[PDB]
């Protein structure tokens, strides 16, 4: 019929299975199938990538009514499997996948190995946030399973180095069902403040950075992302070793989420009244506030000129 090309964005259908299997398309497939995001050689191509809603056991099934036998034709399934955890994906056998994740759910005690960070109730439902390091083996497995979402929904995302111990990972789960709602990979940098500050006390101080932030499409737009950002920022404010809160190359979506929640936080502390009542504020006051909030300087100035446009 002369239609042996298709779009990897509509050909790839990601699924997350609870009692209902929720399906959705990816935002970017180019790091997998090239900048064209076009796959040639397959007629009526479907790529089913499914994850168990609790263990995220991957299952890949590539269906096509016809595929050209030429050597140059790309191998969709092999391409895709190169990015999923090696020897951890059930390919084209649904019963095997179901058995596997059913026997994994029996012993999958996520909340028992990670360190609790905080809870929060949303729409009348309790959700939990957990923190883990990427050197732990179970953390490594779960991260390699949920890692492909970084590539599929975050432009320019790249897999991170798991040998590096500075990587922290926050997991957002449903407390009563154990379904993984989202994850945030963050990194700690050393923060030099001058010979005096660094010489005073022994404790290494850090610039904490949010590197990857993902809420799975099914659970998006329910308030989750905001609650997760606020829980992480709160745990970092309570932490003595953190001195700045940064974010890597945020796109407009995360830009707006960040600005919304940061303005909310600053309003809860009465900075709106302070900044609308005074323009004489001394540099000591500005610096003390900027460091108490643990906000980056540029973001701090943005938020100041924002709070000045209230009411």
């Amino acid at each position: 019929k002369y239609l042996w090309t298709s779009s990897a964005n509509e050909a790839l259908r990601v699924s997350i299975v609870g009692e209902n299997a929720v399906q959705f398309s990816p935002l970017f497939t180019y790091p997998i199938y090239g900048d064209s995001e076009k796959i040639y050689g397959y007629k009526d191509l479907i790529i089913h990538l499914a994850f168990d809603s609790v263990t995220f056991k991957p299952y890949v099934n590539v269906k096509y009514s016809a595929k050209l036998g030429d050597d140059n034709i790309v191998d969709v399934e092999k391409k895709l499997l190169s990015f999923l955890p090696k020897d951890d994906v059930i390919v084209r056998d649904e019963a095997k996948w179901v058995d596997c994740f059913a026997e994994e759910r029996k012993t999958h005690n996520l909340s028992d190995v990670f360190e609790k960070v905080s809870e929060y109730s949303l729409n009348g439902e309790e959700f939990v946030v957990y923190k883990s390091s990427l050197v732990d083996d179970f953390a490594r497995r779960m991260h390699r399973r949920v890692q492909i979402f970084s590539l599929l929904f975050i432009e320019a995302a790249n897999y991170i180095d798991e040998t590096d111990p500075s990587w922290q990972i926050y997991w957002l789960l449903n407390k009563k069902t154990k379904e993984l709602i989202g994850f945030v990979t963050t990194y700690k940098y050393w923060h030099y403040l001058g010979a005096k500050s660094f010489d005073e006390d022994i404790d290494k101080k850090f610039r904490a950075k949010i590197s990857q932030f993902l809420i799975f499409p099914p659970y998006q737009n329910k308030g989750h992302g905001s609650c997760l950002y606020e829980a992480i920022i709160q745990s970092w404010l309570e932490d003595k070793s953190i001195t700045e809160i940064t974010v890597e190359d945020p796109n407009e979506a995360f830009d707006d989420l960040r600005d919304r929640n940061d303005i909310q936080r600053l309003r809860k502390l009465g900075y709106d009244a302070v900044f609308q009542k005074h323009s004489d504020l001394s540099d000591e006051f500005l610096e003390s506030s900027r460091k108490s909030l643990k906000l980056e300087e540029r973001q701090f100035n943005r938020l100041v000129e924002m709070l000045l446009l209230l009411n």
Binding site: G194, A195, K209, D249
Partner: protein, 360 residues
């Protein structure tokens, strides 16, 4: 992507990048450079006279000289002829030359055979301290004890001399034939503890050592790869930096040496020289075999970065200098003129430059 094409690019961008550049081709390639502590003397017509110690390397061709030269800089640097004020015949060649901090007239040199010499600008060769029997690269004066000198050679031996007293300067006050199993790539004195000094070896070990103590070693660090140079900060007593074959510049806290604070990337080959700034707390300069010099601002480690400049490099890389066309043998920051740098390349070129940033 050729050396000469890259150089044409660099000299096309020279105006926008530097407040001052001065290229000078040397008869023989100098292996060491150091600014002398000459107070800024006002001259006629907006000239400023600075002095330099340079060496020679003829490789058995002709006689080598410790050269004292004088550069004239425009007055604007503070806020056109290069002359040799003095020469001195020198045995073999100078690998590193450091003037005594407390006495700018003395000058210590180490040659390709490990012999250490003490020259005087006024008279010349004053002392011949001979303890090493192999080419040595490490030579450091203590800025706290007048006449306390550390020398380090390829024969695993480190030597401590005292030239402050007039008695027996020729013999070493202490020796260590057993501090490392291999070449001493460099040793440096601490800038606040008059009894601490650090060494780096090809045995891929970095040792913080004490002189008073009998241990003589109070911290050891396994390096990823061998370290070629190290430097202590001029503002913090607990902070040091090191660089070696893996092109990353590591930073260490002296109170917890088990783990590098942070390592900065950006060099494409081994790094041979490294020095902290004496003016701006947190500025570090490095040079390597990639013909590149790089200035980092420690206070920018892991800072937020607008994506436009994100591709440009890690946020802690203040600037890069690619005017050299071959491996950089040595360089020095002017202790009186901040951000004024002198550098010497393998291809008989001595550059004197100041970058245009002006923001610490």
């Amino acid at each position: 992507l050729s050396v000469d094409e890259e150089y044409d690019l660099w000299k096309s961008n020279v105006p926008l990048m530097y407040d001052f550049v001065s290229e000078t081709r040397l008869t023989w390639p100098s292996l060491t450079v150091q600014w002398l502590p000459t107070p800024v003397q006002e001259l006629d017509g907006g000239f400023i006279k600075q002095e330099l110690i340079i060496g020679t390397h003829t490789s058995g061709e002709e006689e080598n000289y410790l050269k004292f030269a004088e550069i004239n800089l425009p007055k604007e640097i503070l806020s056109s002829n290069i002359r040799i004020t003095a020469k001195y015949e020198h045995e073999e060649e100078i690998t590193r030359a450091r003037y005594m901090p407390q006495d700018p007239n003395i000058v210590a040199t180490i040659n390709g055979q490990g012999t250490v010499f003490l020259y005087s600008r006024s008279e010349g060769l004053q002392s011949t301290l001979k303890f090493h029997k192999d080419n040595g690269y490490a030579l450091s004066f203590s800025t706290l004890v007048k006449g306390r000198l550390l020398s380090g050679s390829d024969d695993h031996t480190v030597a401590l001399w005292e030239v402050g007293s007039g008695g027996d300067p020729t013999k070493p006050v202490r020796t260590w034939n057993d501090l490392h199993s291999d070449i001493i790539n460099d040793n440096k004195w601490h800038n606040f503890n008059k009894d601490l000094f650090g060494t780096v070896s090809e045995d891929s070990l970095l040792k913080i050592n004490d002189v008073r103590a009998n241990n003589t070693t109070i911290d050891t660090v396994k390096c990823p790869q061998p370290f070629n140079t190290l430097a202590f900060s001029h503002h913090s007593s607990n902070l040091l930096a090191a660089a070696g074959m893996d092109s990353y510049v590591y930073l260490y806290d002296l109170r917890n040496m088990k783990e590098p604070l942070h390592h900065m990337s950006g060099h494409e080959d081994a790094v041979n020289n490294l020095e902290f700034s004496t003016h701006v707390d947190g500025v570090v300069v490095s040079s390597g075999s990639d013909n590149r010099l790089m200035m980092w601002d420690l206070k920018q480690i892991g800072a937020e970065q607008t994506p436009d400049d994100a591709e440009d490099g890690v946020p802690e890389l203040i600037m890069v200098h690619a005017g050299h066309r071959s491996s950089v043998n040595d360089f020095d920051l002017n202790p009186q003129i901040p951000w004024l740098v002198a550098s010497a390349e393998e291809e008989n070129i001595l550059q004197v430059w100041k970058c245009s940033h002006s923001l610490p």
